[PDB]
């Protein structure tokens, strides 16, 4: 699955991974994120992620 990374702080949301420490399960896709959810590095909303592909 797609990689994403946060502009301001490096944190790569990996799709694979999810984020289960802040109630997401692995393979959730980052549209599929909450719109509330935030880089749990530094707490960038959605809007400040990119995906890593071209
Ligand atoms: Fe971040
Ligand atoms: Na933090």
Request: aromatic share 12%; proline share 9%; with cysteine.
């Amino acid at each position: 699955m797609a990689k994403w990374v946060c502009k301001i702080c490096g944190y790569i949301y990996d799709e694979d991974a999810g984020d289960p420490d802040n109630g997401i399960s692995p393979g959730t896709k980052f549209e599929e994120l909450p719109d509330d959810w935030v880089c749990p590095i530094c707490g960038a909303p959605k809007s400040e992620f990119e995906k890593l592909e071209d």
